């Protein structure tokens, strides 16, 4: 059984590299962030451009949706995050306190907290309502490439160029687990599986790994793509077949069977590094986005 993703829409309008695309939890929208300092909102099913959200002074590296699809948070080279009301497009809060580029961000499922990672090597936990920084975790010894809450918000997973993935207790800020690899390649991406029991970690040696973190054991390895230079978003695809989806520095989207680790599809058409992929919450739809030579978002649709 293999998916049959086919190109449906190419979304143009960003004027520099796209950095991140995310589907809204309610499935209605795709949000894209860009080095061009802008957030754009697109219709998930018809690809229709909806609006541009602006205000960051420098380029954006990540954007994330609140669980009710009403808010966005963005992470910028200007050292801030911004919380945006999607309906109005207005900046509700500017989150200040990182001392270098903010690289990655996410809401917790309750969506009263934001977690951020920065080139300043810290992970910060913020109050959505007030914008207060509640905790600063000295998480890593090099830039922090990804931050993600587990299903109930009780854990945070972070990854860094220092070669580590760390699991943190949200309430206390204490590190509960550090996964290490003897070769210590930079960890460029990490995220919890939908059920929260596993983590998917990218390393800059062209490798994705599925870890059981309750046991600290690597259960699967996915290869064949190119990933040596960029922090490329990867995903669990669960609406149809159980896949792993990732961008790649050879301009393709890679899709693997999660259990067998075989590549089941490669999506061709981008003209630069596919820096970001996202999977729709209910339909077999992938959004992909690429760097400076391309600047576009593509929407792909599969029967399974």
């Amino acid at each position: 059984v293999k998916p049959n993703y086919a190109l449906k829409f190419t979304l143009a309008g960003h004027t520099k590299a796209v950095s991140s695309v995310k589907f809204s939890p309610n499935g209605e929208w795709l949000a894209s962030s860009s080095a061009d300092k802008l957030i754009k909102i697109w219709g998930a099913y018809d690809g229709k451009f909806e609006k541009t959200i602006s205000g960051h002074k420098l380029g954006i590296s990540d954007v994330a949706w609140s669980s009710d699809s009403n808010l966005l948070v963005s992470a910028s080279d200007d050292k801030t995050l911004k919380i945006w009301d999607v309906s109005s497009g207005k900046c509700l809060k500017t989150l200040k306190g990182h001392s270098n580029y903010v690289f990655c961000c996410n809401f917790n499922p309750q969506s009263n907290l934001i977690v951020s990672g920065s080139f300043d090597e810290s992970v910060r936990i913020w109050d959505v309502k007030t914008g207060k920084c509640l905790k600063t975790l000295p998480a890593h010894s090099d830039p922090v490439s990804a931050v993600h809450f587990n299903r109930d918000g009780s854990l945070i997973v972070s990854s860094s160029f220092d070669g580590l993935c760390r699991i943190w207790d949200t309430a206390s800020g204490q590190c509960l687990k550090t996964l290490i690899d003897d070769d210590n390649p930079p960890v460029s991406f990490v995220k919890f599986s939908p059920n929260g029991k596993y983590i998917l970690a990218a390393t800059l040696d062209n490798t994705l790994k599925l870890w059981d973190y309750s046991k600290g054991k690597c259960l699967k390895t996915y290869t064949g793509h190119k990933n040596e230079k960029y922090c490329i978003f990867a995903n669990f695809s669960v609406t149809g077949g159980k896949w792993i989806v990732s961008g790649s520095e050879d301009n393709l989207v890679y899709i693997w069977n999660l259990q067998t680790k075989e590549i089941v599809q490669k999506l061709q058409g981008h003209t630069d590094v596919v820096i970001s992929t996202a999977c729709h919450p209910t339909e077999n739809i992938i959004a992909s986005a690429a760097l400076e030579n391309d600047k576009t978002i593509k929407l792909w649709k599969s029967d399974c």
């Binding site: 520099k16 590299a17 796209v18 950095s19 991140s20 860009s34 080095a35 420098l58 380029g59 954006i60 590296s61 990540d62 910028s76 080279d77 580029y101 690289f103 080139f119 830039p143 160029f161 930079p186 800059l204 230079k229 960029y230 922090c231 820096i275 760097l291 400076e292």
Partner: peptide, 8 residues
């Protein structure tokens, strides 16, 4: 640019 769009 943005940090995510720059190679390491």
């Amino acid at each position: 640019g943005s940090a995510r769009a720059r190679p390491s």
